[PDB]
């Protein structure tokens, strides 16, 4: 199955950037490299054989990270079906989700103990210190702020985010999407060294077409240590990013 | 290997559109569904194991088809390294390749006997009857014209093309690219029946990025009879198109 297949790619000590958590970038794509169907169309890409794999990967990571738009589009739970704890991290620069906090599935799971209470990553001063105290008391939420010095062209530095997480004793983070985060992380380097340690992609045998949500990085990206797995319907490629 | 994997997908007689050849649509893609690198960058997608697979598929087809821009970009051979004959078919509506005829690898192979002399598919009256006689004498070229009735908004009808090829006793055609032709054939139906009988895709473990040549159909497309294979570097998916 996928367990021996993934054994070299689950978080491990041989990190080229030890001030950062072990970063897994992982997503499910159609053949034409879409990760969501067009607006109004149901998204069916990954089948249960590879959904199980994703749950297994979540059991090996301290944290799971997605962007606001993923939260808005999917209302994900962001816990682990095996029952191991995993900390949800939401990249929400202006805290758009504030008005939905009481409705979110990830908030509910944090309150029911079926999940861990989330961390939202925002720009400086987006959430006032007393709003943070109320949200922390009412929902268990933490707010983590990125200084303006670490924001370039309106994008928070991935290095700054990961260093904060690592300093909060998050030793491994599973970044699951969406397309913006995937595209940025695929090309993000620190002195030629990729921040992503493991890249694990489910390929579903479907086309979602030109109006689906596309993944493609701004330049070409070479992979190393490639290994393929497949089941009845889906295939999975695991790899590292080349220098 | 890939031989028993491909046995259900190589040309066979159980065809739903017997006035057409058996059509295999087959290409090599990056993970981000690009079939060629950005302008001026080298395109390395398919590794030797699947290059061998492509040559094996050519040995099962009467004909191989590409568009002009593929020929311009790649100057391809379009023969079969196993030594079996395969007829090159070039979709070239205005015969842009006229000026390059003497230089093209595929013409040289036709003249050397390592390949078969090509067929060019043009609009009506693009190549005068005595230019065709000369080109047929000087290079072995055949010109096939598509009637104006079968051309809509500049695009020739695939149903008309394949009918002509079938009527010329091409019983199976391997359509290899490029993106324009792949995108069109992925959605092309005749009374809900796809013209493509087999879809065979090599996925190479690489991203070519946003400036590469993208494959993605204009709407979502479902697959049937999905089967996966993988080697040391590449994966391969074989499927039919769903009704
Ligand atoms: N099939 C799969 O595996 C899979 C997995 C995950 C998600 N998805 C899909 O992905 C789609 C969404 O993708 P998306 O690209 O639209 O959204 P996304 O990547 O989840 O979120 C993007 C947003 O997050 C913020 N953000 C991300 N990186 C940032 C950075 N470095 N600095 C600052 N802010 C940053 C920005 O928020 P602001 O707009 O507030 O600046 C940005 O607009 C959904 O349809 C979802 O279903 C699919
Ligand atoms: N990795 C792989 O498997 C693979 C395989 C093949 C090709 N490729 C790459 O693909 C690129 C070519 O893609 P592309 O989309 O530019 O070219 P293409 O599909 O080979 O040719 C497109 C051109 O062919 C003509 N054409 C196609 N369908 C037609 C139709 N139904 N009716 C009339 N004319 C039609 C038109 O020529 P006019 O402009 O004269 O109308 C059109 O602009 C090249 O870079 C090549 O390297 C990659």
Automatic annotation (TrEMBL), chains A, B:
<comment type="pathway">
    <text>Cofactor biosynthesis; riboflavin biosynthesis.</text>
</comment>
<feature type="domain" description="Bacterial bifunctional deaminase-reductase C-terminal">
    <location>
        <begin position="21"/>
        <end position="230"/>
    </location>
</feature>
<dbReference type="InterPro" id="IPR002734">
    <property type="entry name" value="RibDG_C"/>
</dbReference>
<keyword id="KW-0521">NADP</keyword>
<comment type="similarity">
    <text>Belongs to the HTP reductase family.</text>
</comment>
<protein>
    <recommendedName>
        <fullName>2,5-diamino-6-ribosylamino-4(3H)-pyrimidinone 5'-phosphate reductase</fullName>
        <ecNumber>1.1.1.302</ecNumber>
    </recommendedName>
</protein>
<dbReference type="GO" id="GO:0008703">
    <property type="term" value="F:5-amino-6-(5-phosphoribosylamino)uracil reductase activity"/>
</dbReference>
<dbReference type="GO" id="GO:0009231">
    <property type="term" value="P:riboflavin biosynthetic process"/>
</dbReference>
<dbReference type="InterPro" id="IPR024072">
    <property type="entry name" value="DHFR-like_dom_sf"/>
</dbReference>
<keyword id="KW-0686">Riboflavin biosynthesis</keyword>
<dbReference type="InterPro" id="IPR050765">
    <property type="entry name" value="Riboflavin_Biosynth_HTPR"/>
</dbReference>
<dbReference type="Pfam" id="PF01872">
    <property type="entry name" value="RibD_C"/>
</dbReference>
<keyword id="KW-0560">Oxidoreductase</keyword>
<comment type="function">
    <text>Catalyzes an early step in riboflavin biosynthesis, the NADPH-dependent reduction of the ribose side chain of 2,5-diamino-6-ribosylamino-4(3H)-pyrimidinone 5'-phosphate, yielding 2,5-diamino-6-ribitylamino-4(3H)-pyrimidinone 5'-phosphate.</text>
</comment>
């Amino acid at each position: 199955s996928f367990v021996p297949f993934l054994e070299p790619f689950i978080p491990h000590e041989n990190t080229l950037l030890p001030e950062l958590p072990f970063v897994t970038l992982t997503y499910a794509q159609s053949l034409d490299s879409r990760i969501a169907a067009k607006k109004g169309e149901r998204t069916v890409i990954s089948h249960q054989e590879t959904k199980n794999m994703t749950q297994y990967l979540r059991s090996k990571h301290d944290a799971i990270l997605v962007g606001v738009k993923t939260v808005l589009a999917d209302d994900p739970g962001l816990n682990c079906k095996l029952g191991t704890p995993i900390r949800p991290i939401i990249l929400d620069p202006t805290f758009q989700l504030l008005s939905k906090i009481a409705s979110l599935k990830l908030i509910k799971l944090g309150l029911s103990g079926e999940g861990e209470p989330p961390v939202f990553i925002t720009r400086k001063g987006v959430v006032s210190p007393d709003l943070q105290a109320n949200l922390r008391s009412d929902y268990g939420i933490s707010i983590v702020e990125i200084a303006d010095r670490d924001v370039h062209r309106g994008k928070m530095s991935w290095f700054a985010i990961l260093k904060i997480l690592k300093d909060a004793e998050i030793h491994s983070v599973m970044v699951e999407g969406g397309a913006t985060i995937i595209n940025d992380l695929l090309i993000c380097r620190q002195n030629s060294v990729p921040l992503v340690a493991s890249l694990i992609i489910t390929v579903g045998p479907v086309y979602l077409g030109k109006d689906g949500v596309e993944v493609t990085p701004a330049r070409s990206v070479k992979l190393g240590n490639v290994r393929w797995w497949h089941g009845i319907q889906d295939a999975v490629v695991a790899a590292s990013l080349e220098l």
